[PDB]
Design a protein around this ligand. Structure first.
Ligand SMILES: *C(=O)[C@@H](NC(=O)Cc1cccs1)[C@@H]1NC(C(=O)O)=C(C)CS1
Ligand SMILES: *C(=O)[C@@H](NC(=O)Cc1cccs1)[C@@H]1NC(C(=O)O)=C(C)CS1
Lengths: 256, 256
């Protein structure tokens, strides 16, 4: 098997779950193994924001300070003095993985405990939001805080984006943001054919953790929802995006 | 000088114009020399399309056939049966240099002659659109059909993207498409420090024409708008992307 091969080549542990939503055919490799979710949680976070606010209510302007900035603030560092709307925050979070934008959205929805509550509510008993960004990235093997599984992430992302945990106008918003991600070009998008539309959200964390969760659209036909998660044994390990890209190619062969 | 040295190293002719939009300082080398503009005209074409349609009007669906497909159709070739909206065509044209998409868009704006008129309307007397793609790439030395100059391409791209030929929300679309370009990793982007956002559109044509036009946002400060054009003296000449990355490094140093 080809996932074992990738684990060998990249000295890494892979967690994979893919659902072809046309057929309910499934492709799994350690699907229930826990990983740090890292920034993939931002996608679920916006999902819950969208349930809680009208589209029009996303125009509320949030004021913040240098105190709200954390380790990686690519958009949010430009607008300290003008503020950013909730819509703009969602954009930055999803398209740039802006960690302060995440923390700002999370405060707006009642924090990690409230996010977890709302995840439970949608049927997700696995994903365990506990901390703010980037502390949520510090996860040691065996620990369950700020972890989820490939299967749980898939099921949750499908629920917000494709089923009925959002109305269609808000599903369109989330999908547009994730289609237009800037962070993902070497990962899931690198293992799909050009012309197959991809909406994704990436993550990186401790233990060489390197994740991507995606909706993938064939030219016609129903979408595939995929989570490709990875980690490595040393705390300070590097990751290699090619792993996720190669793993994606294996998934697409097994389903097609 | 250093641009000289790059023509020597790569046996090529270079056309450079850069404008630092903050200071109005300029870097030029053969800035008014004509080159085939090749696929860089796609960016201007979207500019015109945006100007002439409401954002909502981009949702118009275009039906097309195999007869609309030409030499290079990475996205359009997948969607003959479903059609594509003008929006999707603008994404295909800009981020993948989909030649069929450019042609479909050119038709909806009234063709090459009509694109010429509109570019004259925005103040560009230099750029000479005359053909559809890929014919526009066949330019022999000394001809003026489907050529422009680095200066004119900088001037025109700035007009659309940064100035007042478009309202901001349309400016945002054009810019985000070009930032997420897939074709340019080895040209201007390879001459710019990682992390600085880069919007660009590439081209390649006969006589080893190899072009890239870009907006570059330095970490803070106003943007630079840059054209690097290049061509060689044999019709079947190969180009080398490294020429454009190296020319770009030169401009960055001349401006700091
Ligand atoms: C989420 O995964 C985020 N990661 C972290 O904050 C931990 C790190 C910062 C620097 C290196 S690890 C952000 N998201 C992304 C991404 O989605 O790709 C990256 C790469 C770093 S910040
Ligand atoms: C525009 O430049 C396009 N060029 C062509 O269709 C003519 C060709 C030259 C070589 C092969 S076909 C498209 N854009 C690009 C590009 O911008 O990089 C390329 C590489 C070819 S198709």
């Amino acid at each position: 098997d080809d996932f074992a091969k990738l684990e060998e080549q990249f000295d890494a542990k892979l967690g994979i779950f893919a659902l072809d939503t046309g057929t309910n055919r499934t492709v799994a490799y350690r699907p229930d193994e826990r990983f740090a979710f890292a920034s993939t949680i931002k996608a679920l976070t916006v999902g819950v924001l969208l349930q809680q606010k009208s589209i029009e209510d996303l125009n509320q302007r949030i004021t913040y300070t240098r105190d709200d900035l954390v380790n990686y603030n690519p958009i949010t560092e430009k607008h300290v003095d003008t503020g950013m709307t909730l819509k703009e925050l969602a954009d930055a979070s999803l398209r740039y993985s802006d960690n302060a934008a995440q923390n700002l959205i999370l405060k707006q929805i009642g924090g990690p405990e409230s996010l977890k509550k709302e995840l439970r509510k949608i049927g997700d008993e696995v994903t365990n939001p506990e901390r703010f960004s980037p502390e949520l990235n510090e996860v040691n093997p065996g620990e369950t805080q700020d972890t989820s599984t490939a299967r749980a992430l898939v099921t949750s992302l499908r629920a917000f984006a494709l089923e009925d945990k959002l109305p269609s106008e808000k599903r369109e918003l989330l999908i547009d943001w994730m289609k237009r991600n800037t962070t993902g070009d070497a990962l899931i998008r690198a293992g799909v054919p050009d012309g197959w539309e991809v909406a994704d959200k990436t993550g990186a964390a401790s233990y060489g953790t390197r994740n991507d969760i995606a909706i993938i659209w064939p030219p016609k036909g129903d979408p595939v929802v995929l989570a490709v998660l990875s980690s490595r044994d040393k705390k300070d390990a590097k990751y290699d995006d090619k792993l996720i890209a190669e793993a994606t190619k294996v998934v697409m062969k097994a389903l097609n």
